[PDB]
């Protein structure tokens, strides 16, 4: 979604440094408001101490700051963050791999549902759409980006993902629960009907198609699960309490105290707490990692591009089972027909990458 | 890619020490430029303090260094690195196992696509090439090493990975999305056509071949996923901010202060901060681990050898389904034909490795 | 169960802060009693020191507090918590995914058990119920929420999850062990009988149905396993000992000592230990994460909604194999019938999400 994969292809001088200059889906964009509030509160307190408080009050503030500063402990906060963000990142990738792709069903339906006639075409196209509908229905249930595009079941129909007859059949089936599973049932029934009409040769080929369907159903189930079963609220609250506890301490503790009073650790007044602000970016930004990925189907810069996926799948699916049904290129003898050990060429820039075969560690390289 | 597996086969005296003398894909090669800039900036500051600053300015610098040094904290940085590099290393190995190998399809196509005639040969060879094409297409999409070898679809054709007719059929299919999935559809269709021509006996054998194809498709999908879905930019930025924050502190904080002034912790002036430089190699090098593996399909020394894989697969694939179709060696009685409990010999050096059978922990060894 | 997934969809200003204002399944609700006891014991000790102890006793108490405070170490406690809670969270999600769903069997039974006659209907409905019964039986064995709804096998019958004849057959089978596996055997037998009556065409389709059953059986087994095999008691005790050891130290160590005596670290008397209480919420709350998820089938706010699952599954299961058996909507040509590259519309709010196809990192974006 915010792909910088190509920038970090090689480990050169500024591989990671360069990324500090990027705004989209960045730490700056996510921390902006919070940082400003921190900045403000800090310097506000700072001025009160420098310009308002009396000599006696200043002494209390200094004692208060020494107290607060002793409670700004990074080690405990770093612990809970690391473990929590790991959980979030784990679920994050699991949710991606749970986004259903038509390609596997697509390959089978395209080759195993017979007929070069309009019915055979309508059959294959309708099967794929039942798959894609099963997906779109669950996606609009878990993704705010998708839902805002399909807020009502009418949107689904008008967009061409569902026919008005299908919508009629949809409504006819009375159930208080999410009906995303309906198209998945239709598919299996239609696949069976197709086999009985002789459009699907064996049962071996039919079960094979039914299996790939079930897999897609399991995919939709995972998406439902991660959406339903949030990371326990108490856990989420714990890490924010820990993080905020730290910054609360810093607000007062990291204040620049009187240099004259010669407090151990506070010999220099720089007015601006450079390293404290750098710690804020670190920890608040670290929390923002979880904050953004805790729901990867939202509208964040780094949240998944689910709508493009829907579009791509629609186009590719139908194309593979329609225009590509039993439609192959002209079989030719390959360029290496009489060559048992082919030696495909290399461009000038990639010749260094033509390596001798790795036989194994145990063998002498001679 | 940089295999030292054999060097570290045994845990001897210099098993790991020896590796410190290696340059290829080393910590030295990856840190070179960064280290020099660090070295320079350090000693530059050092001379300014020793030769330029006035007695009063020197006192400020010393107070500034004590301030900076107190913010050089390894524990928080070590935390975020460990967790982040773990994520990178995890994806790194996942991407490797997502590189498709023909061998499984190769075995089935070679034995289950009948015919010792030119057509049977052309059939098997074309099937494998559709697999290898499905792979090469996705690899040149995710690997810069491969793309620079196949920058254009013409390169693919001229290299003998795709026929001009196939390229024609390729273009004929209108789609705005990556067409790496096309050959995978062709394969399934060609496999079905082959079965209808009687070249594939049952549907059981056909579905078995279709399954291994789908698996390969899933492999290609994973590669696409890891390439598309980068590690969240904010996360990457966080760890570089933390790391750089540390080295910023060290640049000033680790300066050798006046020994005469007798600052606690700064009693000795060595001019060269040995342990600070050793910390740089540690942490900057630790970050370089992620820096290099964040995209294992690039052109780093330790990035995958994808072009060799392509070459190896091409050669082996075709050879197994062509020259090896229904072609076996002469069946003989094995050397242990009349021996129920064979005792295969051992070389002189390996006799110590002839062990008694491990029956289980519970049994008395008598 | 306590789903806040939609609140945290985007990473905005108060994404996580807002959650601190929630009571259901919160850190406040889980810590309430413990916190009060801590509060009490603290201030009780505090008053004894301020109002009761003599000048000489106060000096002993102050020496005792310095001793206790030196043993309030967060790093070791944070370690064991992180690792332990991770184990708990791991099992927590594993247990969820082990909750059996009918949908996969549901799809097969609905399309592959022939007959639009009362018997065919009774056959399909009875098969599904054997699945759902296999589930309900194990759930009431592991979930207190479910058991309190089905305390006796009579409740199961009267609720319509089991017929009195089935209950009779149930009792007839003499076994000292949990009979949750019984319906799973009935299913396989009934599925075979159904095939012999010609209601299930091939054995390929029958084995396919038998497989999905076995999968459900494995699901039930996992639930049994996690319920039977608790996290080792010693491990659980260790983390509570560590946590309580910390709070024991804090009770005395974190007492506000005499400011006049000028103890290093105790220059200010605030009467209320703000940061110590914040540490309590952190660590006691962190332990509460494990405390709540160690048994996700209990009656906690964040424990699974197993009874709703049972209800939903019952409704959906039967509906899909009965009202939906070979019952499809009217096949129509899709809205994109003559459109090879469909361009589904976007709402006003979601047009920004219409992206160009991601081809791969290697390709020049031009």
């Amino acid at each position: 979604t915010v792909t910088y994969t190509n920038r970090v292809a090689d480990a050169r001088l500024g591989t990671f440094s360069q990324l500090l200059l990027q705004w989209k889906g960045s730490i700056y964009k996510l921390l902006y408001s919070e940082f400003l509030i921190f900045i403000s509160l800090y310097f506000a307190i700072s001025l009160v101490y420098r310009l308002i408080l009396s000599e006696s009050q200043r002494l209390m503030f200094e004692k208060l700051a020494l107290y607060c500063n002793s409670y700004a402990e990074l080690i405990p906060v770093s612990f809970v963050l690391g473990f929590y963000v790991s959980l979030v990142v784990s679920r994050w990738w699991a949710q991606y791999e749970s986004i259903p792709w038509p390609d596997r069903i697509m390959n089978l339906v395209s080759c195993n549902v017979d007929g070069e006639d309009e019915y055979g075409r309508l059959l294959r196209r309708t099967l794929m759409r039942y798959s894609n509908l099963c997906s779109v229905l669950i996606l609009r249930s878990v993704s705010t980006a998708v839902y805002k595009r399909f807020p009502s079941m009418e949107h689904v129909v008008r967009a061409g993902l569902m026919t008005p007859e299908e919508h009629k059949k949809f409504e006819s089936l009375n159930s208080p629960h999410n009906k995303f599973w309906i198209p998945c049932v239709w598919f299996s029934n239609l696949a069976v009907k197709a086999r009985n009409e002789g459009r699907i040769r064996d049962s071996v080929l039919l079960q094979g198609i039914l299996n790939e369907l079930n897999t897609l159903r399991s995919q939709c189930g995972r998406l439902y699960g991660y959406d339903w079963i949030s990371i326990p609220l108490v856990y989420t609250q714990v890490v924010t309490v820990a993080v905020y506890s730290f910054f609360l301490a810093c607000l007062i503790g990291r204040q620049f105290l009187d240099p004259e009073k010669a407090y151990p650790g506070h010999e220099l007044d720089l007015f601006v707490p450079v390293f404290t602000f750098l710690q804020f970016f670190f920890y608040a930004g670290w929390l923002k990692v979880a904050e953004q990925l805790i729901n990867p189907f939202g509208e964040d810069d780094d949240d998944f591009e689910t709508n493009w996926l829907i579009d791509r799948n629609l186009q590719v699916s139908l194309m593979a089972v329609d225009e590509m049904h039993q439609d192959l290129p002209i079989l030719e003898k390959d360029l290496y027909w009489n060559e048992p050990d082919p030696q495909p060429p290399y461009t000038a820039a990639t010749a260094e990458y033509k390596r001798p075969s790795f036989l194994g560690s145990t063998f002498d390289i001679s | 890619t940089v295999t030292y597996t054999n060097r570290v086969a045994d845990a001897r005296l210099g098993t790991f020490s020896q590796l410190l003398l290696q340059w290829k894909g080393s910590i030295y090669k990856l840190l070179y430029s960064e280290f020099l800039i660090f070295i320079s900036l350090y000693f530059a500051i050092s001379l300014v303090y020793r030769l330029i600053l006035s007695e009063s300015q020197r006192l400020m610098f010393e107070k500034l260094a004590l301030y900076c040094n107190s913010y050089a904290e390894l524990i928080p940085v070590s935390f975020v690195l460990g967790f982040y590099v773990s994520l990178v290393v995890s994806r790194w190995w996942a991407q490797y196992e997502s590189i498709p190998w023909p061998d499984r399809i190769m075995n089935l196509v070679s034995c289950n696509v009948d015919g010792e005639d030119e057509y049977g040969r052309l059939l098997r060879r074309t099937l494998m090439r559709y697999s290898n094409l499905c792979s090469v297409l996705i690899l040149r999409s995710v690997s810069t090493a491969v793309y620079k070898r196949f920058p254009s679809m013409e390169h693919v054709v001229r290299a003998g990975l795709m026929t001009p007719e196939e390229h024609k059929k390729f273009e004929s299919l209108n789609s705005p999305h990556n067409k790496f999935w096309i050959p995978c559809v062709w394969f399934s269709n060609l496999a079905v056509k082959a079965r209808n021509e009687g070249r594939i006996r049952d549907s059981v054998l056909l579905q078995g071949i279709l399954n291994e194809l789908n698996t390969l498709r899933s492999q290609c999908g994973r590669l696409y996923g890891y390439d598309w879905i980068s590690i969240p930019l904010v996360y990457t930025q966080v760890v570089t901010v933390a790391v750089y924050s540390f080295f910023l502190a060290c640049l000033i904080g680790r300066q050798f202060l006046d020994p005469e002034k007798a600052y606690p912790g700064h009693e000795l002036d060595l001019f060269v901060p040995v342990f600070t430089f050793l910390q740089f190699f540690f942490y900057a090098g630790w970050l370089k681990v992620a820096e290099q593996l964040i995209n294992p399909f690039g052109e780093d020394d330790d990035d995958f050898e994808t072009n060799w894989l392509i070459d190896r697969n091409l050669q082996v694939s075709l050879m197994a389904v062509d020259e090896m179709h229904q072609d076996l060696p002469i069946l003989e009685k094995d050397l242990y034909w009349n021996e129920p409990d064979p005792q295969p010999p051992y070389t002189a050096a390996t006799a110590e490795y002839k062990r008694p059978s491990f029956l289980g922990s519970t049994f008395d060894i008598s | 169960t306590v789903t806040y997934t939609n609140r945290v969809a985007d990473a905005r200003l108060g994404t996580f802060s807002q959650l601190l204002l929630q009571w259901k399944g919160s850190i406040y609700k889980l810590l309430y009693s413990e916190f009060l006891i801590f509060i009490s014991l603290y201030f009780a000790i505090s008053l004894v020191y301020r109002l009761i102890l003599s000048e000489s006793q106060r000096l002993m108490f102050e020496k005792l507090a310095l001793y206790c405070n030196s043993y309030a170490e967060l790093i070791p406690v944070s370690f064991v918590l992180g690792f332990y809670v991770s184990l708990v969270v791991s099992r927590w999600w594993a247990q969820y995914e082990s909750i059996p769903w009918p949908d996969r069997i549901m799809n097969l039974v609905s399309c592959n058990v022939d007959g639009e006659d009362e018997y065919g209907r009774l056959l399909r409905r009875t098969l599904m119920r054997y699945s759902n019964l296999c589930s309900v039986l194990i759930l009431r064995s592991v979930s207190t929420a479910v058991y309190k709804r089905f305390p006796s096998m009579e409740h199961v019958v009267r609720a319509g999850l089991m017929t009195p004849e089935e209950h009779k057959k149930f009792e007839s089978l003499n076994s000292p062990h949990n009979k949750f596996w019984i319906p799973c055997v009935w299913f396989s037998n009934l599925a075979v009988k159904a095939r012999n009556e010609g209601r299930i065409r091939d054995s390929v389709l029958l084995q396919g149905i038998l497989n999905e059953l076995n999968t459900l059986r494995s699901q039930c087994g996992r639930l049994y396993g996690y319920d039977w095999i608790s996290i080792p008691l010693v491990y659980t005790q260790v983390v509570t000992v560590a946590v309580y050891s910390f709070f024991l130290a804090c009770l005395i160590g974190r007492q506000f000592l005499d400011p006049e005596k000028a103890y290093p670290g105790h220059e200010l008397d605030l009467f209320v230990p703000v940061f110590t209480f914040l540490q309590f919420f952190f660590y006691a709350g962190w332990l509460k994460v494990a405390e709540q998820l160690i048994n996700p089938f209990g009656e906690d706010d964040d424990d699974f909604e197993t009874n709703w699952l049972i209800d939903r599954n019952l409704q959906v299961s039967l509906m899909a194999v009965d009202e939906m058996h070979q019952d499809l909507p009217i096949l129509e040509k899709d809205l994109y019938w003559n459109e090879p590259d469909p361009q589904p519309p976007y709402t006003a709010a979601t047009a920004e999400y219409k992206r160009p196809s991601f081809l791969g990192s290697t390709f020049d974006i031009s």
Partner: antibody
Amino acid sequence: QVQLQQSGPELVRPGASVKMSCKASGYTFTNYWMHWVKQRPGQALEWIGMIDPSKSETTLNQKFRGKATLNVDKSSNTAYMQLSSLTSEDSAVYYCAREVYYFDYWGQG
Amino acid sequence: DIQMTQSPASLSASVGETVTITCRASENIYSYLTWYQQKQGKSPQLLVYNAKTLTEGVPSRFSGSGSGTQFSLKINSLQPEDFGGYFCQHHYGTPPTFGGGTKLEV
């Protein structure tokens, strides 16, 4: 049809500098590496260097390290080469060629 | 660098004849060799690539062979057009050095 149109002939004094062009057409500019070859009477063809239109990555011949410079303009689909510190030996015919495991299309010169 | 040694420096033959030019590599370049035809004043043209494969326009009378360090171009049944310059180039690495050339005269 693939066509590489280079700039016209040039005449300069020693020590000066020159910059010749090469406009490609009939194919995707950025998908093929552009090479430059030097042709002197009696001598063999010399490879000057190559350029990746996409990222403007240059790879020169050690023999031309300080003499030649390469860059492109993706917008105008043209490649450029600059020769500095020109001498009498820098007089020759200069070609630009397209690579596809071989040089299948050259400029007029 | 890889050195390309071409021979003969110049060949003289009459229409109908069959000649054979030879390029030999300093080190193994596998099948990575190309053959170009260049007529005086004009820019070179691709004849054979990958040591054996003929390009589009090239007539069947042209053929390439070899592998490793020994390659050769063979023009059987010469024509009036086939008279001019002929050189080779390896395509294994950078820099892709060229051969000395061969002048085919009548």
